[PDB]
Scaffold this active site. Structure first.
Site, PDB file in Angstrom:
ATOM      1  N   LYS A   7      -7.777  -7.942   7.306  1.00  0.00           N
ATOM      2  CA  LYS A   7      -8.075  -6.911   8.511  1.00  0.00           C
ATOM      3  C   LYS A   7      -8.935  -5.759   7.828  1.00  0.00           C
ATOM      4  CE  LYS A   7      -6.606  -4.153  11.922  1.00  0.00           C
ATOM      5  NZ  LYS A   7      -5.470  -3.009  12.775  1.00  0.00           N
ATOM      6  N   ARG A  10     -12.386  -7.422   7.276  1.00  0.00           N
ATOM      7  CA  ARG A  10     -13.153  -7.659   8.375  1.00  0.00           C
ATOM      8  C   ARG A  10     -13.716  -6.137   8.893  1.00  0.00           C
ATOM      9  NH1 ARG A  10     -11.650  -6.950  13.654  1.00  0.00           N
ATOM     10  NH2 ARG A  10      -9.287  -6.837  13.199  1.00  0.00           N
ATOM     11  N   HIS A  12     -14.060  -3.504   7.213  1.00  0.00           N
ATOM     12  CA  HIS A  12     -14.618  -2.418   6.058  1.00  0.00           C
ATOM     13  C   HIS A  12     -15.719  -2.915   5.195  1.00  0.00           C
ATOM     14  CE1 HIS A  12     -12.319   0.729   8.255  1.00  0.00           C
ATOM     15  NE2 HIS A  12     -11.234  -0.065   7.823  1.00  0.00           N
ATOM     16  N   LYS A  41     -13.483   0.780  19.296  1.00  0.00           N
ATOM     17  CA  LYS A  41     -12.957   1.489  18.259  1.00  0.00           C
ATOM     18  C   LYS A  41     -13.869   2.629  17.878  1.00  0.00           C
ATOM     19  CE  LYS A  41     -10.976   1.506  13.357  1.00  0.00           C
ATOM     20  NZ  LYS A  41     -10.861   0.641  12.136  1.00  0.00           N
ATOM     21  N   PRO A  42     -13.355   3.916  17.914  1.00  0.00           N
ATOM     22  CA  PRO A  42     -14.183   5.095  17.864  1.00  0.00           C
ATOM     23  C   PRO A  42     -14.741   5.572  16.612  1.00  0.00           C
ATOM     24  CG  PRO A  42     -11.988   5.371  18.706  1.00  0.00           C
ATOM     25  CD  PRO A  42     -11.957   4.245  18.114  1.00  0.00           C
ATOM     26  N   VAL A  43     -14.235   5.287  15.343  1.00  0.00           N
ATOM     27  CA  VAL A  43     -14.687   5.495  14.259  1.00  0.00           C
ATOM     28  C   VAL A  43     -14.422   4.370  13.210  1.00  0.00           C
ATOM     29  CG1 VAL A  43     -14.639   7.050  12.276  1.00  0.00           C
ATOM     30  CG2 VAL A  43     -14.382   8.127  14.496  1.00  0.00           C
ATOM     31  N   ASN A  44     -15.475   3.999  12.524  1.00  0.00           N
ATOM     32  CA  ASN A  44     -15.345   2.933  11.316  1.00  0.00           C
ATOM     33  C   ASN A  44     -16.426   2.916  10.361  1.00  0.00           C
ATOM     34  OD1 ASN A  44     -13.718   0.477  10.695  1.00  0.00           O
ATOM     35  ND2 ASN A  44     -15.897  -0.431  10.609  1.00  0.00           N
ATOM     36  N   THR A  45     -15.798   2.900   9.058  1.00  0.00           N
ATOM     37  CA  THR A  45     -16.726   2.679   7.994  1.00  0.00           C
ATOM     38  C   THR A  45     -16.896   1.293   7.190  1.00  0.00           C
ATOM     39  OG1 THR A  45     -15.859   5.045   7.543  1.00  0.00           O
ATOM     40  CG2 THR A  45     -17.134   3.936   5.602  1.00  0.00           C
ATOM     41  N   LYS A  66      -4.142  10.931   3.857  1.00  0.00           N
ATOM     42  CA  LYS A  66      -4.067  11.957   4.861  1.00  0.00           C
ATOM     43  C   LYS A  66      -2.635  12.370   5.455  1.00  0.00           C
ATOM     44  CE  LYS A  66      -7.246  13.999   7.983  1.00  0.00           C
ATOM     45  NZ  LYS A  66      -7.638  15.222   7.167  1.00  0.00           N
ATOM     46  N   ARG A  85     -19.865   5.700  14.449  1.00  0.00           N
ATOM     47  CA  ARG A  85     -19.022   6.696  15.185  1.00  0.00           C
ATOM     48  C   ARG A  85     -19.474   6.460  16.762  1.00  0.00           C
ATOM     49  NH1 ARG A  85     -15.420  11.181  13.922  1.00  0.00           N
ATOM     50  NH2 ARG A  85     -15.240  10.508  11.497  1.00  0.00           N
ATOM     51  N   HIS A 119      -6.198  -0.182   4.291  1.00  0.00           N
ATOM     52  CA  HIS A 119      -6.592   0.910   5.180  1.00  0.00           C
ATOM     53  C   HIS A 119      -7.605   1.880   4.661  1.00  0.00           C
ATOM     54  CE1 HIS A 119      -6.313   4.799   7.167  1.00  0.00           C
ATOM     55  NE2 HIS A 119      -5.897   5.369   6.201  1.00  0.00           N
ATOM     56  N   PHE A 120      -8.803   2.127   5.288  1.00  0.00           N
ATOM     57  CA  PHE A 120      -9.592   2.942   4.980  1.00  0.00           C
ATOM     58  C   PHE A 120      -9.440   4.523   5.304  1.00  0.00           C
ATOM     59  CE2 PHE A 120     -13.868   3.323   3.111  1.00  0.00           C
ATOM     60  CZ  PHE A 120     -14.439   4.576   3.309  1.00  0.00           C
ATOM     61  N   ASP A 121      -9.135   5.168   4.203  1.00  0.00           N
ATOM     62  CA  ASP A 121      -8.548   6.581   4.743  1.00  0.00           C
ATOM     63  C   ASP A 121      -9.573   7.457   4.966  1.00  0.00           C
ATOM     64  OD1 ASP A 121      -5.984   7.901   5.139  1.00  0.00           O
ATOM     65  OD2 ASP A 121      -6.355   9.237   3.367  1.00  0.00           O
TER      66      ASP A 121
END
EC number: 4.6.1.18
Length: 124
Positions: A7, A10, A12, A41-45, A66, A85, A119-121
């Site tokens: 995941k 996929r 990031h 999805k609201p935000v993703n890098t 965080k 975004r 996870h991308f923090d």
């Protein structure tokens, strides 16, 4: 279901380009990476470095996540990334994104054996 590591890949990883190629990069990628299926999805890098370089971050600078978890790691170097975004004109099922390219350290949370990003923090 998806493994946590798959995941992360996929959502990031984009090693196929050195940077976002156009202002439509995010619109295209959020769709093709299946991040607009059930909702926007609201935000993703996305990170434009090799998978090896991103996995390597789990052996770099141990920092707090965080939410206070202890298994986050900050890249020693800056990396090419793209922040996607949702923008005001966006409304499911017609998702719309702003593409922001940057060169920054990434912070990821890692888990498992092999110990890899899950996870991308954040980016700094």
């Amino acid at each position: 279901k998806e493994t946590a590591a798959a995941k992360f890949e996929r959502q990031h990883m984009d090693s196929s380009t050195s940077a976002a190629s156009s202002s439509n990069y995010c619109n295209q990628m959020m769709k093709s990476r299946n991040l607009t299926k059930d909702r926007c999805k609201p935000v993703n890098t996305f990170v434009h470095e090799s998978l090896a370089d991103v996995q390597a971050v789990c052996s770099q600078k141990n920092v707090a996540c965080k939410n206070g978890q202890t298994n986050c790691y900050q890249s020693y170097s800056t990396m090419s990334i793209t922040d996607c975004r949702e923008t005001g004109s966006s409304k499911y099922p017609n998702c719309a994104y702003k593409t922001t390219q940057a060169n920054k350290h990434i912070i990821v949370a890692c888990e498992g054996n092999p110990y890899v990003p899950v996870h991308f923090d954040a980016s700094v």
